[PDB]
Every structure is written in C-alpha cells, then in structure tokens.
Amino acid sequence: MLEMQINLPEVHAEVTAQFVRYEKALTSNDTAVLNELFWNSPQTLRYGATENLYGYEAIAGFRATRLEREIVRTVITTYGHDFATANIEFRRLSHSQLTGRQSQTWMRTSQGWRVVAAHVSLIAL
Amino acid sequence: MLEMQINLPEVHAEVTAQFVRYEKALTSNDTAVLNELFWNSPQTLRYGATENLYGYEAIAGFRATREREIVRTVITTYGHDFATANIEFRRHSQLTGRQSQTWMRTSQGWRVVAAHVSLIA
C-alpha cells in the first residue's frame, strides 16, 4: 500500500531534518556526520561527481581525503514509514555555467535514517 | 526488521526481471515500456544526462522526442516493496556512465520513483 502513504507528515519532516544535517555537514566538511548518515553496509554506494565508490568502507575512506553551494530545487518524497528519496539541484558561483544534481535514497534503519545509495553530477543546461 | 531483509531472493528476482526489461527497452528505444516502468506520479523525477525532468508527464513527453555495455551492476532490495538499481556502463571511450534508480512495489507492479544518469571520465 506504499503509494497511498506518500509524504506522511511525521515521516516527511524527519527525513527533511536528516537531509538538512547532511547538507550542513557537506558544506562544513564534518566527515563524522557525513559517515554517520551513510548506511553501514557493503551494499551502500556513492556515484560521486568524480568517482564511483562501493561499500561503506570505501565511502568513509574517501571522505577522509576529499565547498559552499546554493540549493535551487528540492524534492523530498517519503513512501510509508521507512523509505525516502531526496533530490536536489544546486549551483556554485565557482562554476557558473554548470548545474549540479544530487540524488539520495534513504532507509529507516534500526539506528535511524541512513542513505543507502547516492549519485551526484554536474551538467551544462 | 528491514536490515535483516536485504536481497530476499524472491524480491530480488522480481526487481531484477523488471530492470532487465528496462535495459532492453532502452537499447531498442521501446518507449512504451520505458514509460510503463516509471511511477505515474507528479513526484517521479529523472535527472538525465542532459536535462532534469519533474513528473511522469514531463518524463513521458521527453521519451517521445529522444547500444551500451554494462560494466557493473548492483541491485539491492529492502524488505518486500523497495529497491535500488545502480549500473556503470560504457559506449565515447573516455567516459564511464552511471545510472541510478529507486524502485517501489506499486499496485500495478514495480515502478521507478526516481532516476539519475551521468557520464564522467
């Protein structure tokens, strides 16, 4: 019945708050929170702007070696109690001619909401 | 517990079959199937290699105006009703493509609720 439980209000606001935590950690390079919010599994993956990383271990390892931006559109959708997508467009003044996209899928784990897969890319429109 | 229901094999096989359908439709430009497999909702979105499309209507409208080798595939299912599918692909020898999808079990079957495609060096 997931399609008749879209954007439930407690669920939608919870995922929103975690997304905001993620975005603030990204712009301050708070790697501990960036890692905290990724699902600790070998299945977790991140297709980043410059590389592809498979598994939590690879992602967390990358974060240790790797900033401000404006979000211009956001769609956060929740499906039932335990799953969600968060999609944003963004821009940086450093690269005026490009538009960034970031997609995340989130799952309610027994330690909270975590990102299970993410993809980031910048394109010219 | 959802964490203890990763890649259940019945569920994983369902999602995999639809993903295969999607890939064959993409390579034959079978737009009917490509649209059939996207969630028919205004929330559905596709960040494509060259444009951003919001809502099923925009996506299906784009498909009406529009070969590759898959090099790595990860399909993961969570419980009975949700899944992700991620692939790397190549066609342009200097670039590697990524395609990410999230799938949900709807009352008409498994559908893609969001997707992102991009190519990098």
Residue numbers in the entry:
A (entry chain A): 1 to 66, 71 to 129
B (entry chain B): 1 to 66, 72 to 96, 99 to 128
Paper quotes:
We obtained the X-ray crystal structure of the AtzH. Differential Scanning Fluorimetry (DSF) was used to estimate the stability of the protein and showed that the native protein had a Tm of 57.2°C. Well diffracting crystals of AtzH grew readily, and two different space groups were observed: P1 and C2221. However, an in silico docking simulation between the X-ray crystal structure of the AtzH dimer and 1,3-dicarboxyurea elucidated a potential active site. The arginine residues form an extensive hydrogen bonding network with the carbonyl oxygens of 1,3-dicarboxyurea. Tyr22 is positioned within 3 Å of the carbonyl carbon of one of the two terminal carboxylic acids, and Arg46 is within hydrogen-bonding distance of the hydroxyl group of Tyr22. Tyr22 and Arg46 are therefore well positioned to form a catalytic dyad, albeit one of atypical composition.
AtzH is the first DUF3225 family protein that has been shown to possess a catabolic function, likely decarboxylating the product of AtzEG-mediated deamination of 1-carboxybiuret as part of the cyanuric acid mineralization pathway. AtzH belongs to NTF2-fold superfamily, which contains 38 protein families, including the AtzH family: DUF3225 (DUF: domain of unknown function). Size exclusion chromatography performed on AtzH after removal of the his-tag, suggested that the native protein had a molecular mass of ~ 29 kDa, consistent with a dimer (2 x 14,655 kDa).
